[PDB]
Amino acid sequence: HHHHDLGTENLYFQSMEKYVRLQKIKAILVKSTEDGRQYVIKEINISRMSSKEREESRREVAVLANMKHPNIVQYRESFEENGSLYIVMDYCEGGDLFKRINAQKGVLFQEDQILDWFVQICLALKHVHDRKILHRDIKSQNIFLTKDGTVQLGDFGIARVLNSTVELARACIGTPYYLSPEICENKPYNNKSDIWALGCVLYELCTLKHAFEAGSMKNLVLKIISGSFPPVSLHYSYDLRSLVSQLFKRNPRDRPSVNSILEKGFIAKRIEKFLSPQLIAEEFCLKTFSKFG
Ligand SMILES: [Cl-]
Ligand SMILES: [Cl-]
Ligand SMILES: [Cl-]
Ligand SMILES: [Cl-]
């Protein structure tokens, strides 16, 4: 300490467990030196964050760390060292829904299979949205299958608030296919922007393709705003086709809430396959949250 700051590196840990890097997949597949079990670690740089970016990152990790649901990838722990934050998540051995969709090689899924997966995604999102939390990454690449076939929404991507410009930017660089009309017009990100993205995923499960595609980023934006997409096979029920259309309403407030999706009979009847009576009572009836504290 003789300057023109030593001791300002963040050190945080909760356990002695050590992880060996296996492969990049800012995500790394690792193996525990304790018992060889595999996990995914997401590395986030912290040293070059402003004071505000750090307080928000902290608040996001705390939310990640407290999320527990059978259809959300289980957080294990986090640690900080060497100017980075590392978040340790369970590894879903079945891989992501994006690969599962391509594995079909054009063979449409059975409607029962679609809806059994979809209900699980909805249960996950209900849990997140009930707490007034957004999820910036409802995408097939971020929904996974466990070894026993359970669908899990990736925990990474939950957010306490989102900037419409930043999300638009992230999309022009990463994946643009889940952009909602409002984000395309630089209007505020909201819970129904998540519902749009959920719709894109359902559409992918119904058709094996993205709903909105175009030869340029600027024209993809215009096609999303127009709300015009190739219809789902009429082989699927009117209930399912009807839902798809509701999820792609242009005005966010015209899209159904996730509660509203789950109360639809053809979906409601499946919930008991995935939640116990106690969790159903807690999730749907008893535990209430509000934008008032
Ligand atoms: Cl199938
Ligand atoms: Cl995750
Ligand atoms: Cl609206
Ligand atoms: Cl909602």
Residue numbers in the entry: -20 to -17, -10 to 10, 17 to 284
Tell me, in the authors' exact words, what the paper reports.
Eleven NIMA-related protein kinases (NEKs) are expressed in humans. At the protein level, it has been shown that NEK1 stabilizes the complex between ATR (ATM and Rad3-related) and ATRIP (ATR interacting protein) through phosphorylation, priming this complex for Chk1 phosphorylation. Overall, our structural model of the kinase domain will help the design of NEK1-specific inhibitors as potential anticancer drugs and other Nek1 reported diseases.
A T162A construct spanning aa 1–328, with an N-terminal His tag, was the only one rendering diffracting crystals. All crystals grew from related conditions containing polyethylene glycol, and all belonged to the same crystal form. These crystals allowed the NEK1 kinase domain structure to be determined to a resolution of 1.9 Å (with inhibitor 1) or 2.1 Å (apo). Following building of the NEK1 model, residues 1 to 284 of NEK1 were resolved in the electron density with the exception of residues 11–16 from the kinase domain’s glycine-rich loop. A significant portion of the N-terminal purification tag which was not removed before crystallisation was also visible in the electron density and formed crucial crystallisation lattice contacts. Contrary to what would be expected in an active kinase, the NEK1 activation loop formed an α-helix of three turns in length. However, it is also possible that this conformation is close to that required for auto-activation. It would only require movement of the loops between Gly165-Tyr169 and Gly148-Leu153 to position T162 for autophosphorylation in cis.
